[PDB]
Design a protein around this ligand. Structure first.
Ligand SMILES: CC1=C(/C=C/C(C)=C/C=C/C(C)=C/C=C/C=C(C)/C=C/C=C(C)/C=C/C2=C(C)C(=O)CCC2(C)C)C(C)(C)C[C@H](O)C1
Length: 304
């Protein structure tokens, strides 16, 4: 009776920060140069209090040829290439960009941001004024908590263009692994999920899932089956820090158990400087395997 798509409804009182997809949808309506200017503005102002971590060396190497090609272009053509990405135009650059994992896309724009600051890539025109709709989108972004701001910016970047990923880091040494503690939750599957993800131990992590089980990242559709979920762990889930705090455990239909945990997560892009408020919603089968886990970005503290 449980389907993945029906399991999406467990713990319906959980208020997700759906202002994030709402804002992305508004952003996606904008003129391309407005999109690019808006992120430049948001990025400049955010950088006054938050520092982005440098892209990894492997990621920089993978994006290097594309970056070099843009830098060699004349200023008008550099701007056109960036507009192509924002417009999701079909071009060789846009197809290369689309083959990249999120971290490589993010590191590509990190470097273009440095080069625009230095004047070596064509900057946003001086004195540029955003459109009416764009100004309102930027205002909305600047009113969000930092965890929601960086999620808007990430999703905007990942949406550009029209599989290349970083190498997979070896799992953390067993002796140096730390274990989480969750108020009210001693469920071994949940604790093993948190601890193995915190150790980048994706091969152990995936064995917690049913063959047909699914993982639903914030504001995304469920990723279904062990092959696809493992691919997602390896491409996108390295070096996270999960800090679960508290939870609740309840029976579900057919001998299943449903568990909701709240806490914080840190991305390696910002470390301890941005703590995202997160809920995990687990649906476990009678053997304790993960049939479904959703990860939600919460609308505020006071969803924790
Ligand atoms: C795009 C662009 C520019 C550059 C923009 C840049 C450099 C933006 C960079 C933004 C970054 C680095 C954002 C990073 C965001 C990271 C986030 C939101 C990570 C969140 C991860 C989470 C919530 C992980 C949760 C997970 C948990 C807890 C699990 O249990 C399972 C795995 C999963 C991943 C779901 C500039 C150059 C500034 C201007 C130009 O005109 C346009």
């Amino acid at each position: 009776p449980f389907t993945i798509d029906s399991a999406r409804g467990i713990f319906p009182n959980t208020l997700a920060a759906d202002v994030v997809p709402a804002t992305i949808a508004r952003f996606s309506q904008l003129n391309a140069e407005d999109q690019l200017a808006l992120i430049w503005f948001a990025y400049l102002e955010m950088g006054k209090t938050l520092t982005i971590a440098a892209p990894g060396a492997a990621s920089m190497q993978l994006a290097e040829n594309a970056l070099k090609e843009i830098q060699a272009m004349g200023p008008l053509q550099q701007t056109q290439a960036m507009c192509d990405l924002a417009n999701r135009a079909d071009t060789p650059l846009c197809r290369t960009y689309a083959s990249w994992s999120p971290n490589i896309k993010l590191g590509f724009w990190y470097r273009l941001g440095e080069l625009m600051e230095q004047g070596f890539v064509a900057p946003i025109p001086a004195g540029y004024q955003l459109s009416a709709n764009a100004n309102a989108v930027l205002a909305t972004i600047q009113g969000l908590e930092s965890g929601q701001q960086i999620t808007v910016l990430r999703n905007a970047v990942v949406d550009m263009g029209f599989r290349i990923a970083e190498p997979v880091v070896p799992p953390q040494d067993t002796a140096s692994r730390t274990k989480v503690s969750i108020e009210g939750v001693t469920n071994a599957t949940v604790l093993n999920y948190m601890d193995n993800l915190n150790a980048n131990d994706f091969d152990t992590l995936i064995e917690l899932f049913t063959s047909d089980g699914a993982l639903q990242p914030p504001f995304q559709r469920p990723i279904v089956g062990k092959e696809n979920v493992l691919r997602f762990f390896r491409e996108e889930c390295q070096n996270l820090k999960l800090i679960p705090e508290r939870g609740v455990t309840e029976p579900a239909e057919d001998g299943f158990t449903q568990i909701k945990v709240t806490g914080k997560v840190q991305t390696p892009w910002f470390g301890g400087n941005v703590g995202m408020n997160i809920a995990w919603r687990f649906l476990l089968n009678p053997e304790g395997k993960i049939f479904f886990v959703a990860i939600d970005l919460l609308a505020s503290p006071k969803e924790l």
